[PDB]
Amino acid sequence: ATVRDPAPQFSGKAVVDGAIKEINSNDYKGKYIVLFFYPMDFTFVCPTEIIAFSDRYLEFEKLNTQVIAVSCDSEYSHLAWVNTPRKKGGLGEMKIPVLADKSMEIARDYGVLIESAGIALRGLFVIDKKGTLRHSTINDLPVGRNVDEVLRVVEAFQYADENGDAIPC
Amino acid sequence: ATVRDPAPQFSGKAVVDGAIKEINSNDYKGKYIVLFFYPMDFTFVCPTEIIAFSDRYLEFEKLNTQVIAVSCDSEYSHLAWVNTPRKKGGLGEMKIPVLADKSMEIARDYGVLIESAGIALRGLFVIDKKGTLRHSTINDLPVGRNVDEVLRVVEAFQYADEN
Amino acid sequence: ATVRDPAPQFSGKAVVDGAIKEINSNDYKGKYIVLFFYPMDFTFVCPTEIIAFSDRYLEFEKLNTQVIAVSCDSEYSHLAWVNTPRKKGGLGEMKIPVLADKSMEIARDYGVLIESAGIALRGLFVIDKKGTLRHSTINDLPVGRNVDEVLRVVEAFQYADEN
Amino acid sequence: ATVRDPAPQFSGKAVVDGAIKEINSNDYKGKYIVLFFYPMDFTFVCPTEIIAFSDRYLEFEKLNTQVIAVSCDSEYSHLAWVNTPRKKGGLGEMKIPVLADKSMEIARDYGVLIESAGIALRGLFVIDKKGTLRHSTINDLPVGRNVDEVLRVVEAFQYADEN
Amino acid sequence: ATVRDPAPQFSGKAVVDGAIKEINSNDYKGKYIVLFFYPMDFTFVCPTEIIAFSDRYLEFEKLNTQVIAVSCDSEYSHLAWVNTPRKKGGLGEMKIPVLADKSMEIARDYGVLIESAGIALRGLFVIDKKGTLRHSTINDLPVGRNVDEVLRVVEAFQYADENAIPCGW
Amino acid sequence: ATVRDPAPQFSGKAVVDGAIKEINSNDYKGKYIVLFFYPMDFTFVCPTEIIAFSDRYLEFEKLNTQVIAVSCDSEYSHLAWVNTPRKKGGLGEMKIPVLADKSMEIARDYGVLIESAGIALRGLFVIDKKGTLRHSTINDLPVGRNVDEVLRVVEAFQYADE
Amino acid sequence: ATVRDPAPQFSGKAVVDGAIKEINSNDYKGKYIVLFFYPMDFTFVCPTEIIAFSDRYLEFEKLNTQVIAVSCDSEYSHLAWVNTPRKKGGLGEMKIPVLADKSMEIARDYGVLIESAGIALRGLFVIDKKGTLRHSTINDLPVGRNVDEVLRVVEAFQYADENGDAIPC
Amino acid sequence: ATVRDPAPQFSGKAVVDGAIKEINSNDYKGKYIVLFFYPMDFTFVCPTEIIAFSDRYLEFEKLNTQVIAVSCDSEYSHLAWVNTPRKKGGLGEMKIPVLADKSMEIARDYGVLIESAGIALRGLFVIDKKGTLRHSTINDLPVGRNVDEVLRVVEAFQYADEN
Amino acid sequence: ATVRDPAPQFSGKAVVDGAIKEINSNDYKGKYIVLFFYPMDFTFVCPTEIIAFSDRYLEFEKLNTQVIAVSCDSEYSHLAWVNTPRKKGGLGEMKIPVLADKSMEIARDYGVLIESAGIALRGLFVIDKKGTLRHSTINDLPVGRNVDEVLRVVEAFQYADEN
Amino acid sequence: ATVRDPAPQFSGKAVVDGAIKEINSNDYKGKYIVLFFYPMDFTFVCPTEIIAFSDRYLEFEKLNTQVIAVSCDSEYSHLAWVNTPRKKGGLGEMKIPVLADKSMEIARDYGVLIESAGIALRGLFVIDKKGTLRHSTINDLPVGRNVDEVLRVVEAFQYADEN
């Protein structure tokens, strides 16, 4: 699974609008998709990054992109975490879907799965409206991702796509 | 892994005194072990079964058996759940260890793993002090396990073993 | 052969109502089936278990489930054992069919066969009307099975099935 | 496994003095061995054949040969049949050992096993004091074996052995 | 190839009535067949066995069974042995066919062939009219086979086929 | 080739101080490495990205990290582009090494090679002093990489280590 | 892939008349083809051979042959080198096509690729109008190729084709 | 196995001077060997060729060559044929060894065996003192071999060998 | 393969009547074929053998048989040799065809090829009108072949064909 | 087997100074070697090319290179062609070695062998003192090679070697 190749389809139960709901990749066609991987729920570390994406979701919606958080934890554990306040280390309200990959099929398709640990690496993927992979970021567990950069990259791809790659020196 | 054959060793991070601690199967040698499998944490259903074993743990201690709950969930989710009050559907205090099988390796060794769903079936296993498997109960997801039966089988095996 | 997967079909000569008769698993579709495995006929141990099921067969019939005892012995030895009075250590009247698995094919399909000894483990299986496996119990040879438990699990599954 | 090759060793629990006892092929070295296979216990047919051998065992003893009956039934079924009087169709007292091959391994080694039915064909084997196979007769199920013939072949081979 | 399984077909040049002739197994489908194997022609040992069968062939004929002697020797060697007087150690007149299995194919099908020596063991086989194998006797080389027994077994099988008796009480 | 695994070693002739010199990954010990992949030399597009790294090279050096630009072009073509003025769309002076991967072995080891086109994707790799891979960014051809981000990530990993 | 076997087709972007253009082997049908392989662009060595071919291209044209230079460098680098004056060590104007084999597939098809170096040897191939390979020369890197010889060979093959066939002593 | 390659060793029981005796190829290592293959004993056809060889054996011995007849028949059948008078179609006295290859191993090694018929082709082989094969003639069954030619070939090879 | 099997077809350019011509085995149907192998051209040794065959070709024609000399040399080398007078070592006139097996495919099909030397052994083959191989003689390089024998063998086989 | 890779060694009987002599590649150390492959001997076409190399051999000796003509023909055919006057279409005297590759091993090592025809293509190879291949020319059969070009290439490489 590499850049310029059709991104692996994915589906499963995710927490949406405070309720567990089935989501599918084909539900979002004509829009960019950002697949966001994080290792595990209920970690002692404050989950500032994912919250950052959820809060700044409107910006993504405006860019016609769907952000989807995903982990190898059950959707029930996800929902529990959603109902846990942010002050307590919970997620609080999440304006983006949080998807369960208990099967671990997704993290393996996206090649971010640590078989040994049963957890996903800190990976991020950008998929155009055609469903092709345009970008991949993979961070080792200690390091999070900046939202501004992701937005920059998405805007960049949209611009290049509508304005075929120009500006010579 | 079948009955009369040595049960697969297992180890991992588990929640025990409301705190996470590494446990190993060999930590309980000279004692019977009851491996208790459940699908997932934070299910909407009240965890009456697992709670029942935890509450009636003393009967097991008297029978020189260690009961161990295990699932394919993170040890963190486990810890969260224990710290969740029983009124909200949590486990509250647990006098038995709750083991994390995030790798899903354990559920695979005991062949109770649903590969498609990434969760374990309701399987229960009894292992003697010699480490051999004497009993396996495997239930489909909707149906739970009775504590008294497990106690009867353990009591039974112990009696047969001495006589 | 695992839980949630369609249970293996089975057929063969069994002693039913005191006579040797060919029976097939598909004869009981639309009914739950409890497959009961025992090691050997004419064991010195009093066959209290199989008798218990036979006696309490009515309770199973009210629940529309068919219990079938099965072993790796010839149907003739079965018939002999049935025709042997209980005071002598026999089975006496059996209100459930006792099935011969001389081929050992069945015990192998249900994976309860001890290859070295040519005998079946004390295994028990629950099959829905669809023919899918909902429950498996496997005991090492010394320990028997409780009727009340089997009934509870059947009632439970039927309940899940109805709502 | 063919004639002129060392005959497969065999061992197992057999009914001998009206009691179950472990016997081994190597217990009988320096004596010829006649391995006698029969399909099943408790057949409706009168067991005239096995009885004939047991009764005329002394003639075999005079030739310093041990005759051993063997079947794929449990030693318990054997004991039951021995404890069944000849008038009712049982074996009554048997002056030859009746060996249990529940594993079916033995019948398989001598290639007399009907895998489909789990029963042995009517085979008979003659083994010298060195343990080599000198003769094999295999009859389909309906037809029995003559004692006088077996005695003739043994007398013949012993004669050949000395000259 | 075991008892209760259809016996392997066989054909070949055999000595019949003093002349070499092609015979085939299917010629006898209305009759039981007794296939008689012996190691070699012109052995120093008096061929008492084969002779016994040849002499008492009429008894087999009364039972509608065909006896056939067979060896791995050429039909010419067979014929030579037939033309050798019994007093000189020959077979003399033979009222049963003596079949050549020079290819050794037959002896191999009935699994009585000693590959190392190129000779057949003293094996005997009884085949019903269906062509199914009902009986096999295999003797090491020093010990011969009794005619009366073969007759007993054949009669027994025929009786059983058309016709047991429980002990009961 | 995955994150947390020792990153593949690499060597080859590169343009560094305006001259061709044999370079190796092991030459830079005690320092982080930023492996910068770009498709081709002499593209019509102004090489704003590579130049950006070259200009802000001091910032990487202060962090004891070595940035290395790499492509599947000959070291000679590299030298040519370097000697080509920025006004013409060239690179001018480059304060970082520019490595030739004509064999394309490097781009294959880092799994960024388009086998069909013979060019590397816009990939970037971060390697610690221990030589283990900590980060990979891979962009399709139209999109460039921001320096501040790379610096942020390096800062992050170095801090966690320390 | 050897002489007397149909020569491998090839296509790709090449610099023609100072501009990049996709060229294909089939564009020159009915004409002989001389495939000229050279290691790399921007070599310090004065490109005397390639210049020689480009200059004496008319001679090739009179013989109905198209000469094509090819290397494993990008078509952009090619265009760059072409725009560099010959006094500076560049190619300047090139009257023959210069083809880019960045994939290296072509150099691999003609077995002139140094896998280790990713460069082509100084190989040259002659292909008739039927598309079959009639001649191959392969030189190690230090030694260049002579034009007059190539011409002798093309004229020779054309002559043999037109003049059936030999001439006895 | 081809010409100029070491000829396959061979051994077995052969009738020599009218008696059966075990012979081996290595018994003749200082002399050339002519291996003579023939289809069958007791053919209606008069065995004139092989007899011719036996008679002119002295010429071969004079050339320090050993001629050996071989067939796929038993050594007993061979002996019978030797002891059968020539007038009646037998071989009578044979001054060369007649070797039995009942196993058919030899004819297969020399590649003259008709697997289908179990008989040898009319093949002839010349083997030097080094044991290497120098010549092979193979005739279809109807056509025999001339002694004089073989002799020519042997003289030729000895002559070639010294100069 | 060997004798009694259809002989391998063969073709190639050969020198006929002092001239080069493409020849095929199938050109000669209804007549026997003798394939004659010799190692190499222009040897210092006098080509007495091939000349002998060429001279007595009429005898073969009377038998309706075609003798064909063949080697692994070019047809040009052949033609050169033919045009070289026998004096000084050439072949002179050849009344039989001389076939080029430059490919060596033929010598390999008849299994007479020395792979190491790239030359054919002195092999000779007889093929009936039906195309089956009836005879093979193979001589090591030092020893030649006699014409009379070949004639005897052809006469024998033709005789057999008619009888 | 490619340029810049060590060239395959070769050896064999070649005609040297009008006589057959064994030659080897390693005999020429400290010298370049030009391996000249030509299809066949005794072609009707005037052998102008090979003659050209033989005549202009001195120029090669001045450059310290050994030119070796080679073909898939016997060294005997070679000797014949040498002994054939040039007026007759022969080579006459040859001041260069003519090597026999009857095995065709060499033409295969240099990959110039047409397997179907058994002849070599018009290939030419240049080998340095180090034994490495520096140049390969391969021409289809109709077209010859220019000597001057070969000289230019050798001169070029020696020059590159010294500077």
CSV table of C-alpha atoms in Angstrom, one decimal, chain A residues 2-4 111 114 119 121 132-147 149 152-153 156-157 160-161 165-169, chain F residues 2-4 44-47 86-90 111 114 121 133-146 149 152-153 156-157 160:
chain,number,residue,atom,x,y,z
A,2,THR,CA,1.8,3.1,-1.3
A,3,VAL,CA,1.3,6.7,-2.3
A,4,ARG,CA,-0.5,7.0,-5.7
A,111,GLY,CA,0.7,-1.0,7.6
A,114,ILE,CA,2.6,-3.4,15.7
A,119,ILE,CA,-1.5,-1.4,18.8
A,121,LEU,CA,1.5,3.3,15.2
A,132,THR,CA,-6.0,7.5,-4.0
A,133,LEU,CA,-3.4,8.0,-1.2
A,134,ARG,CA,-1.6,11.3,-1.5
A,135,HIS,CA,0.2,11.5,1.8
A,136,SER,CA,1.4,9.4,4.7
A,137,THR,CA,2.9,10.5,8.0
A,138,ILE,CA,4.1,7.9,10.5
A,139,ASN,CA,5.4,9.0,13.8
A,140,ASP,CA,6.8,6.7,16.5
A,141,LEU,CA,4.7,6.7,19.6
A,142,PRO,CA,6.2,9.6,21.5
A,143,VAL,CA,5.5,12.3,18.9
A,144,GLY,CA,2.2,13.8,17.9
A,145,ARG,CA,1.0,15.6,14.8
A,146,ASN,CA,0.4,19.2,14.1
A,147,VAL,CA,-3.0,20.1,12.6
A,149,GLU,CA,0.6,21.1,8.7
A,152,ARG,CA,-1.5,22.9,4.6
A,153,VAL,CA,-1.0,19.6,2.8
A,156,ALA,CA,-1.8,22.0,-1.3
A,157,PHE,CA,-3.2,18.9,-3.0
A,160,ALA,CA,-2.5,21.3,-7.5
A,161,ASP,CA,-5.4,19.1,-8.6
A,165,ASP,CA,1.3,22.1,-11.1
A,166,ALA,CA,2.8,25.3,-12.3
A,167,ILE,CA,5.0,28.4,-11.5
A,168,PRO,CA,8.5,28.0,-13.3
A,169,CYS,CA,11.4,30.1,-12.1
F,2,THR,CA,9.4,0.4,9.0
F,3,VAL,CA,9.4,3.0,11.9
F,4,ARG,CA,11.3,1.8,15.0
F,44,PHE,CA,11.1,23.6,-14.5
F,45,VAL,CA,9.6,24.3,-11.0
F,46,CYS,CA,11.6,26.6,-8.8
F,47,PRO,CA,13.4,24.4,-6.3
F,86,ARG,CA,18.8,30.2,-9.1
F,87,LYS,CA,17.6,32.9,-11.6
F,88,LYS,CA,17.7,30.2,-14.3
F,89,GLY,CA,15.8,27.8,-11.9
F,90,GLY,CA,19.1,26.3,-10.6
F,111,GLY,CA,10.6,2.2,-0.3
F,114,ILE,CA,8.4,4.6,-8.4
F,121,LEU,CA,8.6,10.1,-4.2
F,133,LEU,CA,14.0,5.3,12.0
F,134,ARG,CA,11.6,7.5,14.0
F,135,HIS,CA,9.5,9.2,11.3
F,136,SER,CA,8.5,9.0,7.7
F,137,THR,CA,6.5,11.5,5.7
F,138,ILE,CA,5.6,10.6,2.1
F,139,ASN,CA,4.1,13.1,-0.2
F,140,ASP,CA,2.7,12.6,-3.7
F,141,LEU,CA,4.7,14.7,-6.3
F,142,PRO,CA,2.7,18.0,-6.2
F,143,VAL,CA,3.2,18.7,-2.5
F,144,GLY,CA,6.3,20.0,-0.8
F,145,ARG,CA,7.5,19.7,2.8
F,146,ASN,CA,7.7,22.4,5.4
F,149,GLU,CA,7.6,20.9,10.8
F,152,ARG,CA,9.4,20.5,15.3
F,153,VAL,CA,9.6,16.7,14.9
F,156,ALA,CA,10.2,16.5,19.7
F,157,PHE,CA,12.2,13.3,19.4
F,160,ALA,CA,11.8,12.7,24.4
